[PDB]
Amino acid sequence: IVGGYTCGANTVPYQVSLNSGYHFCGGSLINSQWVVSAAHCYKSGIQVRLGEDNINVVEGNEQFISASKSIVHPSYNSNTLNNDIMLIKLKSAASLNSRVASISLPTSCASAGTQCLISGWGNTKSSGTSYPDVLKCLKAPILSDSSCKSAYPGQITSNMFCAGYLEGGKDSCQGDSGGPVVCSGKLQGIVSWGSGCAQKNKPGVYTKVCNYVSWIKQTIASN
Ligand SMILES: NCCc1c[nH]c2ccccc12
Ligand SMILES: [Ca+2]
């Protein structure tokens, strides 16, 4: 997260870190045994880390649970990043509490102008490289479809939306991938892609979660 703020320990209780020897992506806990992330975060040997603030220090509220299975969306295209969504099932159910909690799926899509919270452990620099240990947060509005398409000609599908600031300076970044965009207590977005981070006229692009609620529910019900 570039140009954000320190969230505060366990204030984003649905935020997870995906670990394969190291943090490599964010995710969102949507029930006691399932996490939503980005399809471009797919790899084998994933351990889901819940209740994290400092990802380099065991602080006492963590739950580490290995993934039993990952399900990349059937229509995910890694070239265009269309349908950039993946489900991860935990080998055992997380113990839910005030610091490890699920986030609700949307019942409706959020409109341009809606204020949201974007979070993660990604790079905090737009040019350099610096990775924080504690969770970073950014409040950002959803941008109009037209401004999003104008920013990225030929690249925005109906399964994507832009959020952030056309002036630059505030954005998600590398390592935030797969993490949450939450608006009014609903998971509306997944950190997907962009051209660099926090660059003028290049806002972050996010997977449009409301398009996937049926697939998510249906998949969980049979897996
Ligand atoms: N807005 C951040 C989009 C993003 C995801 N992964 C990245 C890697 C490098 C640069 C940007 C990104
Ligand atoms: Ca920790």
Method underlying the structure? X-ray
Q: Which fold has domain 13-102+211-222?
A: Thrombin, subunit H (2.40.10)
> Residue 6 forms beta bridges with which residues?
136
CB-CB contact of 86 with 215 (8 Å): no
CB-CB contact of 191 with 197 (8 Å): no
Ligand 1 lined by 173 (C-beta under 6 Å): yes
Residue type for position 59: E
- In whole angstroms, what is the distance from residue 106 CA to residue 120 CA? 20
Handedness of CA 117, 203, 113, 5 (dihedral sign): positive
User: Which ligand is nearest to the Cα of residue 19, counting in written order?
Assistant: 2
Is there a common fold for 1-12+103-210 and 13-102+211-222? yes
Sheet with 204-208: list strands edge to edge: 5-6, 136-141, 115-120, 180-183, 186-193, 204-208, 160-163
Q: Which of 153, 177, 202 is nearest to 28 (CA)?
A: 177
CB-CB contact of 175 with 158 (8 Å): no
Going from the Cα of 218 to the center of ligand 2, the distance in angstroms, rounded, reads 33
Which residue bears the tokens 């220090």?
57
Q: Which fold has domain 1-12+103-210?
A: Thrombin, subunit H (2.40.10)
> Residue 190, CB half-sphere, CA atoms under 13 Å: how many?
33
Ligand 1 lined by 174 (C-beta under 6 Å): yes
Q: Where are the domains of the chain?
A: 1-12+103-210, 13-102+211-222
